[PDB]
Amino acid sequence: NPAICRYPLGMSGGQIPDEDITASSQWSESTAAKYGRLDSEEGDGAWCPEIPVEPDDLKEFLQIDLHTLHFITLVGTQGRHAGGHGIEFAPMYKINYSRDGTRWISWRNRHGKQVLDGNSNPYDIFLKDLEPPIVARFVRFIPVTDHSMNVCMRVELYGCVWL
Amino acid sequence: GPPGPPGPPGPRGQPGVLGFPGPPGPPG
Amino acid sequence: GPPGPPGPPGPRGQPGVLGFPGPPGPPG
Amino acid sequence: GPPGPPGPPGPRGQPGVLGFPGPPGPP
């Protein structure tokens, strides 16, 4: 199934409109949620929280509304390249998702681990398979750090429409 | 009739890009 | 009369926002 | 005649100021 259900869902291509991308906070209008699209250089290069992310206080998030239920098999993330001088990225992150938009589900891999290893630099696209895959309308990327740091993220969701 | 005067100045340019990230902090 | 020529370029945009704080200092 | 059309948009603003130094290294 994951062989056919592996298509980018709209972050890089624009299929997912700006209005459907929101966040917990933003450093500036130029780093608002809508700029958190994989490989984009628009605005100041990515979505970036207003304050540093602390290791014991995971309160930031980048939220995508797909409107209809989708099967999400992989996710991709990047930091903020910004023409070559950006240094911000999320080293790790968690994925929360929802069907109704009211109750949130914490994604856990087959071993019960919620934290996914992320980027190690601001420019490379890093992909992660989701096993088990998720069915959701809303997907949230929650940056996770091991020390206080100013993160930024550009992302993409891969999968297909449900039913 | 005489040509009209030159048009008015154009719109203001777009905001500049973000400043570079600051330098590394001091030693612990 | 005929329209005047195009106006001149507008003013430069506002400066970009301040950059992010630098990375943590190294062990000391 | 009427005034000519408005001029083209102005050049983009200058780069923002460099960020502040990072926090101190670990204690």
Numbering used by the authors:
A (entry chain A): 26 to 188
B (entry chain B), C (entry chain C): 4 to 31
D (entry chain D): 4 to 30
Task: Please quote the authors directly.
Diffraction data to 1.6 Å resolution were collected using synchrotron radiation and the structure of the DDR2 DS-collagen peptide complex was solved by molecular replacement. The DDR2 DS domain is an eight-stranded β-barrel arranged in two antiparallel β sheets (Ichikawa et al., 2007). At the top of the barrel, five protruding loops (L1–L3 connecting β1 to β2, L4 connecting β3 to β4, and L6 connecting β7 to β8) create a trench that accommodates the collagen peptide; the disulfide bridge between Cys73 and Cys177 lies at the bottom of this trench. The DDR2 DS domain interacts with two of the three GVNleGFO motifs in the C-terminal part of the 80 Å–long collagen peptide, burying 530 Å2 of solvent-accessible collagen surface with good shape complementarity (surface complementarity score, 0.71; program SC) (CCP4, 1994). In the DDR2 DS-collagen structure, the leading and middle chains of the collagen peptide (for a definition, see Emsley et al., 2000) account for 40% and 60% of the interface, respectively; the trailing chain is not involved in DDR2 binding. The central feature of the DDR2-collagen interface is an amphiphilic pocket at the top of the DS domain that accommodates Nle21 (leading chain) and Phe23 (middle chain) (for consistency we use the same numbering scheme for the collagen peptide as in our previous work on SPARC; Hohenester et al., 2008). One wall and the floor of the pocket are essentially apolar (Trp52, Thr56, and Cys73-Cys177 disulfide bridge), whereas the other wall is dominated by three charged residues (Asp69, Arg105, and Glu113) interacting with a string of water molecules. A salt bridge between Arg105 and Glu113 forms two hydrogen bonds with the hydroxyl group of Hyp24 (leading chain) and contacts one edge of the phenyl ring of Phe23 (middle chain), suggestive of a C-H⋯π hydrogen bond (Brandl et al., 2001). A comparison of our complex structure with the NMR ensemble of the free DS domain shows that collagen binding leads to a restructuring of loops L1 (bearing the critical Trp52) and L4 (bearing at its base Arg105 and Glu113).
